[PDB]
């Protein structure tokens, strides 16, 4: 429905390392 419960499973962490 939304984003975020998608995106916690990365967030700034995975997505700045990957």
């Known amino acids: 429905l ?3 419960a998608e995106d916690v499973g ?3 962490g995975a997505i700045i390392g990957l």
């Open 2 to 4: 939304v984003f975020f």
């Open 10 to 12: 990365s967030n700034k």
